[PDB]
Structure 1
Amino acid sequence: ELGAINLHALSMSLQSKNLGEINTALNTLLVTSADSNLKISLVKYPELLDSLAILGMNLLSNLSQNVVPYHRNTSDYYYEDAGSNQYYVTQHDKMVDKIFEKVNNNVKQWDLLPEPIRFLPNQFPLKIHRTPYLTSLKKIKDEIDDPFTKINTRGAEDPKVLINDQLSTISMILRNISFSDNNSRIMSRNFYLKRFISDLLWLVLIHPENFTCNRKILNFKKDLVIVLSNISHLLEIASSIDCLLILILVISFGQPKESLTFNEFQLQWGKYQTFGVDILAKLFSLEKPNLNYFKSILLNKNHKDKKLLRRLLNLYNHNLLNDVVSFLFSAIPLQQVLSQSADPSLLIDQFSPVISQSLTSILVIVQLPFVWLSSEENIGSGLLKLSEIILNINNSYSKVLLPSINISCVQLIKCLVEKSICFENCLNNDPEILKKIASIPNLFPTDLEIFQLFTNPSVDIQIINQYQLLYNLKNDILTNLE
């Protein structure tokens, strides 16, 4: 609303008392919500973010430890005195006191600021919470009215819900802060913020029950993936755990039911399943020898951290990243190719290309004991018909069309050849594969289409080469089949 001017509320937030925390947190949340003219600039801000992450870490911690803060019987919790000193004592003379002490009767370590993040003793990894968007109805069922709602829609008559909603509000305001330049202020350097993200993840998914309303869990997942969307730079300090966490977070969406495990999403409900692949591209483009490499180790099937990692993979039971493939294969098809026109496509088309980009990128990362193939009466590939659509569009938004179709073709050829050569190297399957490969209606654009293409547009040279080499591999497969 109004009033509500200053920024320095951070001070009060930094303070460790329930009162100040409420007073600020609620206000500043309402603030960052308002945007008509209300934005949080950056001058000497950062202190805000620090304070925030510190607060969240401590609260979530002692929550996991199941102990209420803000109220004990200790206070001003260290030394209090006015002893024998003016300014400089505790030299040699101090031992005299010992002497004194021996005749009158007739060093420390200090912890760092935040607490540890993982290895927490009570918190030991047991598989829970790998459930899909379905829980919304759970949420409904939870939020459903019933003689036992236990939704204290009012304030904290008990501190548990207090901590819950506290963290909730913190998450929300954190989201709202994250919609501008000053993403650079958030850019992977608020080591505090990253610690917060990490441990929050490690809880929300490995969540021994302390969260009241599942809807709170949804909120957390949701604004979390959003604020991720507004990151386009490094992550994954103490990576591996965090990398797997983020993967499970994005996998949260899409309906499950070898073959593809994911019914493609009927695009009229959700918009987060978007954010998922959005991040899995953006925050994954960095070919720096860390992130890509973490997921590469995730191909496999302090030091205790490593124990954790495999500890979850077998606690997700073969391979798993096929699930990531299937997930990536959602939201593209079966609606635009089933519409009445190609214009309403362009909207979600804008969204589409990053997906194929992510896919082909991960296919640079698959070149060892597996069984993988993903064209088995599961998708076919309307990619060809889609390419034709965008082509006809070309000769009849923008700036994304040509790259989309190009990378679609590249995707096709690369996945084909990689499948073939992989099951060649293993050679655990009959040459029927070729015949199998030769048995796709969604494949190998007809040579007549190639020909007529070779004439009209004349504005697609690179694409012409794409189709050219594609058809080349096609004819090769035909020949060497016999």
Structure 2
Amino acid sequence: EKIDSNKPIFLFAPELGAINLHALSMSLQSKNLGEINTALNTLLVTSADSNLKISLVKYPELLDSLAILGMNLLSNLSQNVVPYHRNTSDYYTQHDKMVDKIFEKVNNNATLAVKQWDLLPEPIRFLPNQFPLKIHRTPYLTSLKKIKDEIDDPFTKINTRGAEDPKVLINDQLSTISMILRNISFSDNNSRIMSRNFYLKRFISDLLWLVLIHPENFTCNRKILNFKKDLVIVLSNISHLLEIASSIDCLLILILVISFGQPKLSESLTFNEFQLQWGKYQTFGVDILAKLFSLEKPNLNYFKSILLNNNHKDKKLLRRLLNLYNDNNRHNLLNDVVSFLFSAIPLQQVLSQPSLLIDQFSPVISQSLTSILVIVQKILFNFNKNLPFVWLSSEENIGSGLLKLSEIILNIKVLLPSINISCVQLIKCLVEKSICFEN
């Protein structure tokens, strides 16, 4: 242990000297393995540090590089290809041509097209190998148990190393890229720039698809969980300006966000309390939803269409995925989303014992109420089940909790006046929707 702590593996921040963003970008754009790995390690050590600002305003192309690199890697990972040490080469007037072609024809008898290619590869889901058979909706606690079981095995492959297996190398490069994006998303200018970047959103879509639909190519369960954590943290820092590009992205974002809850075992609420000390990654999902719903443009229209029910390929894939999720088994996704949002409000914990806890939890309560209110007022006739009534009579009695929260706030710090009104509004709207749905 001491030897490992003193060994010269890589530089730490105080000895990187002057860091050059242009040189790191050009290193990433070359196709040399050592250049890429050195650039990645330097970027990780820099971005993970405090007192060191990576300003993308002064050199934006850097971001593109990273994203583009990631995309190609994902492709190579899905089709079982290895990009390094290819054993290939890697290199490469009409009158005059008429004349010398006549010359060639004469000498041969004597001896007796436009190119097209794209900058990026086709996404990741139109590939004939990537067709959905199953959605992997493993919860968070079960994922932690799997990670513990795979590390505590005698014949564990957790330390194969990068020079002994190329798939481990591709996975390590992808993990580093994701950590770097997560680290640099923590600033105003970088977040504003990252919200509108075209390559970043395509990379996010590809990684979401590969993590949720075809996760067999990753070598570790911990790497899958870390990809998910990085995704929710980036989206949480960025979604206040994000415009979604497809409906499949909205579906995958919903699945990713609700995967961080605790399901029980439809007619009742399908999620449990998900305590407080167990995790805090659920708050990021609540925050992502509250901000994404804010845009009554492409994002709201997509979510409405998904929750209530190349473009041809997208329609076929959407139908396939919805049938895979729900298998009168309709609106299971609505029920799951709203039950997740309700389970995020720590009712039993705050009501059991009171001012300090609500002071510490007012942001997540505020945004959970905002999202539930948007769903109830704006999204909600193909229904065959009185949904708001099964939310009202759910055996957990959330209405009583909302009313008790309102009362506790009354007898009692900038959000409370909004939380009172949200609580009472939500109760009233749920009751009225119950009656109208029954009609």
**Is 1:261 equivalent to 2:270 in the alignment?**
yes
Q: 1:127 to 1:183 in 2, by over 3 A?
A: same
8 Å CA contact 2:56, 2:62 repeated in 1? no
8 Å CA contact 1:234, 1:286 repeated in 2? no
Q: 1:247 to 1:374 in 2, by over 3 A?
A: farther
8 Å CA contact 1:267, 1:335 repeated in 2? no
Corresponding residue of 1:354: 364
Q: 1:23 to 1:4 in 2, by over 3 A?
A: farther
Deviations, residues 446-478 of structure 1 (Å, cap 9, x unaligned): xxxxxxxxxxxxxxxxxxxxxxxxxxxxxxxxx
Deviations, residues 340-388 of structure 1 (Å, cap 9, x unaligned): 4xxx654664544555555455545556999875644453431222122
Deviations, residues 212-240 of structure 1 (Å, cap 9, x unaligned): 11000010000110011111434354320
Count of residues in correspondence between the two structures: 405
Instruction: Give distance in 1, aligned partners of 2:46 and 2:429.
Output: 46
Aligned-pair CA distance for 1:321: 1.1
**Is 1:32 equivalent to 2:46 in the alignment?**
yes
Deviations, residues 392-421 of structure 1 (Å, cap 9, x unaligned): 22xxxxx53433433333433443333333
Corresponding residue of 1:17: 31
Aligned-pair CA distance for 1:265: 1.2
Instruction: Give distance in 2, aligned partners of 1:13 and 1:370.
Output: 59
8 Å CA contact 1:226, 1:275 repeated in 2? yes
Aligned-pair CA distance for 1:295: 3.4
Larger mean CA deviation between 8-17 and 198-207 belongs to 8-17
Instruction: Give distance in 1, aligned partners of 2:399 and 2:424.
Output: 16
8 Å CA contact 1:256, 1:263 repeated in 2? yes
* Pick aligned residue for 1:116 from 123, 127, 137: 123
Instruction: Give distance in 1, aligned partners of 2:313 and 2:364.
Output: 36
Instruction: Give distance in 2, aligned partners of 1:2 and 1:422.
Output: 66
Instruction: Give distance in 2, aligned partners of 1:265 and 1:5.
Output: 43
Instruction: Give distance in 2, aligned partners of 1:377 and 1:265.
Output: 14
Deviations, residues 170-192 of structure 1 (Å, cap 9, x unaligned): 00011000001123443432100
Q: 1:378 to 1:371 in 2, by over 3 A?
A: closer
Q: 1:183 to 1:3 in 2, by over 3 A?
A: closer
Instruction: Give distance in 2, aligned partners of 1:31 and 1:25.
Output: 10
8 Å CA contact 2:185, 2:234 repeated in 1? yes
Corresponding residue of 1:270: 279
Larger mean CA deviation between 165-174 and 330-339 belongs to 330-339
Q: Which structure shows the higher helix fraction?
A: 2
8 Å CA contact 2:218, 2:224 repeated in 1? yes
8 Å CA contact 1:54, 1:192 repeated in 2? yes
Instruction: Give distance in 1, aligned partners of 2:93 and 2:173.
Output: 31
Deviations, residues 299-355 of structure 1 (Å, cap 9, x unaligned): 219311011112111101843211111111123234543454xxx654664544555
The unaligned stretches of length 5 or more in structure 1 are: 81-91, 394-398, 424-481
Secondary structure in structure 2 of the residue aligned to 1:121 = coil
Aligned-pair CA distance for 1:166: 0.7
Q: 1:373 to 1:402 in 2, by over 3 A?
A: closer
Aligned-pair CA distance for 1:118: 2.4
Q: 1:64 to 1:348 in 2, by over 3 A?
A: farther
Q: 1:371 to 1:48 in 2, by over 3 A?
A: same
RMSD: 3.4
Deviations, residues 261-317 of structure 1 (Å, cap 9, x unaligned): 111111112111111101111222222354354334432193110111121111018
Q: 1:208 to 1:353 in 2, by over 3 A?
A: closer
8 Å CA contact 1:225, 1:276 repeated in 2? yes
Q: 1:50 to 1:327 in 2, by over 3 A?
A: same
8 Å CA contact 2:244, 2:299 repeated in 1? no
Q: 1:116 to 1:402 in 2, by over 3 A?
A: closer
Q: 1:194 to 1:101 in 2, by over 3 A?
A: same
8 Å CA contact 1:236, 1:242 repeated in 2? no
Instruction: Give distance in 1, aligned partners of 2:40 and 2:201.
Output: 23
8 Å CA contact 1:250, 1:273 repeated in 2? yes
Report the identity percentage: 99
Instruction: Give distance in 1, aligned partners of 2:78 and 2:227.
Output: 16
Q: 1:266 to 1:420 in 2, by over 3 A?
A: same
Q: 1:111 to 1:137 in 2, by over 3 A?
A: closer
8 Å CA contact 1:42, 1:182 repeated in 2? yes
Corresponding residue of 2:355: 345
Q: 1:349 to 1:375 in 2, by over 3 A?
A: farther
Q: 1:29 to 1:334 in 2, by over 3 A?
A: same
State the TM-score, normalizing by the size of structure 1: 0.76
Larger mean CA deviation between 136-145 and 348-357 belongs to 348-357
Corresponding residue of 2:141: 134
Q: 1:347 to 1:163 in 2, by over 3 A?
A: farther
**Is 1:305 equivalent to 2:303 in the alignment?**
no
Question: Which of these two proteins has the greater Rg computed from alpha carbons?
Answer: 1
**Is 1:58 equivalent to 2:72 in the alignment?**
yes
Q: 1:265 to 1:64 in 2, by over 3 A?
A: same
Larger mean CA deviation between 259-268 and 224-233 belongs to 224-233
8 Å CA contact 1:356, 1:407 repeated in 2? no
State the TM-score, normalizing by the size of structure 2: 0.82
Q: 1:63 to 1:50 in 2, by over 3 A?
A: same
8 Å CA contact 2:344, 2:368 repeated in 1? no
The unaligned stretches of length 5 or more in structure 2 are: 1-14, 378-386
Secondary structure in structure 2 of the residue aligned to 1:335 = helix
